[PDB]
Design an enzyme around this catalytic site. Structure first.
Site, PDB file in Angstrom:
ATOM      1  N   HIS A   1       0.879  -1.088   0.101  1.00  0.00           N
ATOM      2  CA  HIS A   1       0.000  -0.094  -0.014  1.00  0.00           C
ATOM      3  C   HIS A   1       0.796   1.228   0.006  1.00  0.00           C
ATOM      4  O   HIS A   1       2.082   1.222   0.157  1.00  0.00           O
ATOM      5  CB  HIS A   1      -0.892  -0.025   0.943  1.00  0.00           C
TER       6      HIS A   1
ATOM      7  N   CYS B   1       3.416   5.501   5.491  1.00  0.00           N
ATOM      8  CA  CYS B   1       3.723   4.161   6.115  1.00  0.00           C
ATOM      9  C   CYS B   1       5.206   3.749   6.289  1.00  0.00           C
ATOM     10  O   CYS B   1       5.756   3.877   5.358  1.00  0.00           O
ATOM     11  CB  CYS B   1       2.983   3.049   5.773  1.00  0.00           C
TER      12      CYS B   1
ATOM     13  N   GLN C   1      -7.360  -2.814   9.787  1.00  0.00           N
ATOM     14  CA  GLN C   1      -8.723  -2.004   9.819  1.00  0.00           C
ATOM     15  C   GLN C   1      -9.463  -2.480   8.774  1.00  0.00           C
ATOM     16  O   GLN C   1      -9.269  -2.755   7.662  1.00  0.00           O
ATOM     17  CB  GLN C   1      -8.109  -0.479   9.849  1.00  0.00           C
TER      18      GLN C   1
ATOM     19  N   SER D   1      -6.258   5.621   9.750  1.00  0.00           N
ATOM     20  CA  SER D   1      -4.773   5.986   9.369  1.00  0.00           C
ATOM     21  C   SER D   1      -4.618   7.216   8.638  1.00  0.00           C
ATOM     22  O   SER D   1      -3.648   7.804   8.653  1.00  0.00           O
ATOM     23  CB  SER D   1      -3.953   4.841   9.128  1.00  0.00           C
TER      24      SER D   1
ATOM     25  N   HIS E   1      -5.438   5.438   1.618  1.00  0.00           N
ATOM     26  CA  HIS E   1      -4.500   4.150   1.059  1.00  0.00           C
ATOM     27  C   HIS E   1      -4.803   3.973  -0.321  1.00  0.00           C
ATOM     28  O   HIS E   1      -6.099   4.040  -1.002  1.00  0.00           O
ATOM     29  CB  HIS E   1      -4.793   2.898   1.676  1.00  0.00           C
TER      30      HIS E   1
END
Ligand SMILES: OCc1cccc2[nH]ccc12
Ligand SMILES: OCc1cccc2[nH]ccc12
Length: 147
Positions: free
Chosen positions: A43, A97, A115, A138, A141
């Protein structure tokens, strides 16, 4: 009719039918083709000021708005789809990330680990397919299913 999550739509600009997946936010002109215990995904994450932790290896304090993060995500998708950039290169350079250091690769995972919006998109992708913008706590993505 169509694989899980897919529906027909009409282009506002051109009038031609296209296909949209409301689980992955993928969209494409071509009719979608054709569940495993585990999938492997990479991702690219873009965080924003309302992310659960507005901090990353790229920036100590992330201040961009959610709208600005979506615009960045949309632009990365455009360059990946045109072939100007590879997913792996953009993930290594720009993902918020720490998995950026592995070209975005998360390894393999099962349901009940990630998630929920991320898990649902990951398992609705076919091997080799890429999502549209996927929203979690977060951030936003782009997900690439590799296995
Ligand atoms: O974890 C710190 C780090 C080391 C090496 C490469 C990296 N890329 C993004 C973070 C990062
Ligand atoms: O759960 C979603 C997810 C999967 C893998 C890596 C991640 N980093 C930030 C969110 C996140």
């Amino acid at each position: 009719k169509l694989p899980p999550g897919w529906e027909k739509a009409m282009s506002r600009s051109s009038g031609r039918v296209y296909y949209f997946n409301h689980i992955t936010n993928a969209s494409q002109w071509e009719r979608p083709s054709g569940e495993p215990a585990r999938v492997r995904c990479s991702h690219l994450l873009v965080k924003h000021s309302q992310s659960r932790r507005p901090s990353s290896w790229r920036q100590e304090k992330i201040t961009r708005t959610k709208e600005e993060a979506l615009e960045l995500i949309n632009g990365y998708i455009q360059k990946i789809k045109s072939g100007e950039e590879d997913f792996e290169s953009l993930a290594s350079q720009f993902s918020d990330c720490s998995s950026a250091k592995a070209r975005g690769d998360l390894g393999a995972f099962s349901r009940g680990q990630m998630q929920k919006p991320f898990e649902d998109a990951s398992f609705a992708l076919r091997t080799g397919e890429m999502s549209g913008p996927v929203f979690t706590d977060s951030g936003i993505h782009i997900i690439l299913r590799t296995e």
